[PDB]
Amino acid sequence: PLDTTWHRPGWTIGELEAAKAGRTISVVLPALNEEATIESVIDSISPLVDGLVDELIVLDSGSTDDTEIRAIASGARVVSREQALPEVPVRPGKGEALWRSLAATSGDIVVFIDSDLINPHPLFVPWLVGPLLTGEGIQLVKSFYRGGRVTELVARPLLAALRPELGCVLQPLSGEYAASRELLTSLPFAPGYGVEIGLLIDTFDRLGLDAIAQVNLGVRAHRNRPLDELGAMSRQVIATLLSRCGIPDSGVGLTQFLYTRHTWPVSLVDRPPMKVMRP
Amino acid sequence: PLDTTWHRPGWTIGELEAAKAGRTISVVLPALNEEATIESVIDSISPLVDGLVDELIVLDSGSTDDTEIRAIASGARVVSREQALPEVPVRPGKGEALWRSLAATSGDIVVFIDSDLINPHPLFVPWLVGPLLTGEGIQLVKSFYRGGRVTELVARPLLAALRPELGCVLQPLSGEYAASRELLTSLPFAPGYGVEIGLLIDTFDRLGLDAIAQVNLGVRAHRNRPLDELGAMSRQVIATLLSRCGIPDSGVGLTQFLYTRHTWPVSLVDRPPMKVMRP
Numbered sequence: 127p128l129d130t131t132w133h134r135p136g137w138t139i140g141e142l143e144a145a146k147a148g149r150t151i152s153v154v155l156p157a158l159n160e161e162a163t164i165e166s167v168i169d170s171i172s173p174l175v176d177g178l179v180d181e182l183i184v185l186d187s188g189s190t191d192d193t194e195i196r197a198i199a200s201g202a203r204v205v206s207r208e209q210a211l212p213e214v215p216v217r218p219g220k221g222e223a224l225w226r227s228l229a230a231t232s233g234d235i236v237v238f239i240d241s242d243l244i245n246p247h248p249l250f251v252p253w254l255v256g257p258l259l260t261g262e263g264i265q266l267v268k269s270f271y272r273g274g275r276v277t278e279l280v281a282r283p284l285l286a287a288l289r290p291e292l293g294c295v296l297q298p299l300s301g302e303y304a305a306s307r308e309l310l311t312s313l314p315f316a317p318g319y320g321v322e323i324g325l326l327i328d329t330f331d332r333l334g335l336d337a338i339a340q341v342n343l344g345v346r347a348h349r350n351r352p353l354d355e356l357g358a359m360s361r362q363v364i365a366t367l368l369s370r371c372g373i374p375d376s377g378v379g380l381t382q383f384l385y386t387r388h389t390w391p392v393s394l395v396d397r398p399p400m401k402v403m404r405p
Numbered sequence: 406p407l408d409t410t411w412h413r414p415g416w417t418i419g420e421l422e423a424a425k426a427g428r429t430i431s432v433v434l435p436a437l438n439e440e441a442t443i444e445s446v447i448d449s450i451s452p453l454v455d456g457l458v459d460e461l462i463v464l465d466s467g468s469t470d471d472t473e474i475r476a477i478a479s480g481a482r483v484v485s486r487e488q489a490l491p492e493v494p495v496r497p498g499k500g501e502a503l504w505r506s507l508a509a510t511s512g513d514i515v516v517f518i519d520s521d522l523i524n525p526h527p528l529f530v531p532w533l534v535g536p537l538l539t540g541e542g543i544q545l546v547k548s549f550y551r552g553g554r555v556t557e558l559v560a561r562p563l564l565a566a567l568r569p570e571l572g573c574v575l576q577p578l579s580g581e582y583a584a585s586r587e588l589l590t591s592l593p594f595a596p597g598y599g600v601e602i603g604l605l606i607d608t609f610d611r612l613g614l615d616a617i618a619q620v621n622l623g624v625r626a627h628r629n630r631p632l633d634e635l636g637a638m639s640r641q642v643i644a645t646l647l648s649r650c651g652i653p654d655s656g657v658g659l660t661q662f663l664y665t666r667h668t669w670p671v672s673l674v675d676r677p678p679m680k681v682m683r684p
């Protein structure tokens with residue numbers, strides 16, 4: 127019931143560029159300690175810059191490895207969380223990085239690509255902007271691909287429980303997606319790893335499915351992470367998913383026993399629509 | 406904040422038997438197509454029968470392999486779902502099997518052990534009944550052990566969200582546990598894989614933490630299952646967890662794309678306290 131592109135899109139890069147019609151395109155790579163993979167990601171996209179893509183930045187989210195220098199050495203403009211929006215003290219987590227990135231870009235369209243990807247296709251970005259450029263009323267495009275543990279155990283089943291209309295979204299937690307600035311600066315940003323699911327639900331609640339498309343980027347592979355770190359992500363995802371369905375979340379961080387005790391942070395605080403930051 | 410036994414319990418089998426004080430003990434092994442492991446499980450426990458354990462049954466939950474014959478050949482009494490409670494048509498899923506098993510046993514105490522376990526300790530049952538026998542006010546004992554994907558990504562984080570008081574339960578989805586008949590026949594049984602989480606939350610809501618204990622059974626290993634089957638389990642878990650927290654579940658089955666479409670069953674229907682079936 128949702129515009130789904132199942133096979134390779136047929137649009138060429140030159141067509142897509144024509145279709146821009148004065149609209150600009152920014153690409154954001156959020157990055158926290160992805161030195162091993164960041165360069166490969168930037169290189170997959172930088173050939174588009176000054177063409178289809180008018181602007182590409184790395185939003186460095188507090189990295190302490192060589193993420194930033196290697197990214198710079200790949201010719202990318204690197205922006206710290208502090209630099210994107212310096213008047214506002216920095217909070218931890220991905221959603222903060224993406225939210226701040228709105229203040230550090232000016233494209234009418236914004237594309238997000240995770241910086242921990244292993245050999246991403248150089249057509250990811252063209253594939254994602256296709257529906258925004260050539261559709262009508264599309265404001266949001268999610269990717270999917272071909273094993274998604276938080277997605278298949280947490281997000282998809284909870285959506286089935288609480289927003290079953292979104293059951294047709296194959297990769298709701300996908301980190302590769304694009305959306306209009308008009309949409310993005312109109313929506314709040316959930317903290318931490320909650321940011322994607324919030325955007326999907328907020329978009330839907332506000333514009334319905336017809337405003338959402340999804341595109342097959344084939345197959346992704348990325349940094350596989352330790353189960354305890356996913357419990358933490360899953361917690362924040364849950365937190366946000368619930369607060370969008372008007373359910374009071376305890377605000378209690380998930381506690382695991384490695385036996386040694388550890389309690390991960392959770393946040394019930396969204397960033398407001400970036401629009402409010404407009405002077 | 407919950408009675409937790411972290412190391413090997415010190416009670417001997419003969420002490421525990423003395424402590425029974427006229428109370429009887431039934432052990433139930435629910436089983437659906439566990440021919441490879443069922444015999445090992447029965448053998449771990451049958452030496453206790455006519456001693457500490459007064460009764461042991463296998464609740465055969467519709468098996469079509471050699472589960473039943475191999476179980477019989479290990480000297481176990483085998484009871485079909487139909488035989489446990491024949492006046493009532495059989496529904497699919499684990500909770501149904503466990504619920505029916507109450508009608509097919511008469512122990513004052515009931516112990517559940519999954520039948521897909523690989524080399525279970527012969528002390529599992531003594532370890533589980535310890536707190537029921539020697540405690541006061543304990544009506545429920547959960548096991549834990551030393552990677553628990555639905556548990557760590559779905560159940561523990563959701564509990565943190567919705568019943569954070571149960572955050573201290575290490576293995577809420579554990580299939581090895583024991584409880585009083587008085588408690589069990591007083592509680593409804595969630596369908597499918599929802600049965601455990603429901604029992605934990607219902608018990609807590611009704612008696613609080615002081616009625617619950619948990620015991621380290623060291624380390625379990627069992628049938629590792631395909632992610633898509635866990636999505637289905639996770640769905641039912643979610644469904645039940647939500648309905649206990651007064652949250653309306655859509656009643657919509659989880660839908661996955663293997664790309665081929667498949668929609669798994671979910672049930673919003675509990676069995677009533679078995680007490681109501683008392684003539």
Ligand SMILES: O=c1ccn([C@@H]2O[C@H](COP(=O)(O)OP(=O)(O)O[C@H]3O[C@H](CO)[C@@H](O)[C@H](O)[C@H]3O)[C@@H](O)[C@H]2O)c(=O)[nH]1
Pocket residue numbers: 156157158159160187218219220223239240241242243276299300301302319320321322323348349351363
């Ligand atoms: O505080 C952070 C954490 C992560 N990231 C970046 O965000 C991307 C995704 O983070 P990651 O740790 O790889 O998350 P995943 O395990 O891949 O989580 C999946 O599901 C999450 C829930 O929405 C999404 O954030 C991810 O994009 C998605 O791939 C990575 O490139 C990170 O460099 C930050 O910039 N800051």
Ligand SMILES: O=c1ccn([C@@H]2O[C@H](COP(=O)(O)OP(=O)(O)O[C@H]3O[C@H](CO)[C@@H](O)[C@H](O)[C@H]3O)[C@@H](O)[C@H]2O)c(=O)[nH]1
Pocket residue numbers: 435436437438439466497498499502518519520521522555578579580581598599600601602627628630642
């Ligand atoms: O319809 C069914 C399904 C399962 N079982 C038996 O129940 C036990 C547990 O089922 P399983 O498929 O192994 O579930 P798990 O993946 O191990 O799920 C974990 O989490 C579940 C959620 O509560 C619990 O039911 C399990 O006991 C627990 O180990 C097994 O011995 C099965 O033989 C049935 O009797 N009938």
Ligand SMILES: O=C(O)CCOP(=O)(O)O
Pocket residue numbers: 273274275276277278299350351
């Ligand atoms: O967002 C998710 O679904 C978790 C991604 O990690 P993985 O389970 O290894 O694919």
Ligand SMILES: O=C(O)CCOP(=O)(O)O
Pocket residue numbers: 552553554555556557578629630
């Ligand atoms: O109940 C659970 O947590 C799922 C058990 O299977 P596994 O993740 O392989 O340990």
Ligand SMILES: [Mn+2]
Pocket residue numbers: 240242348349
């Ligand atoms: Mn990743």
Ligand SMILES: [Mn+2]
Pocket residue numbers: 519521627628
């Ligand atoms: Mn199992």
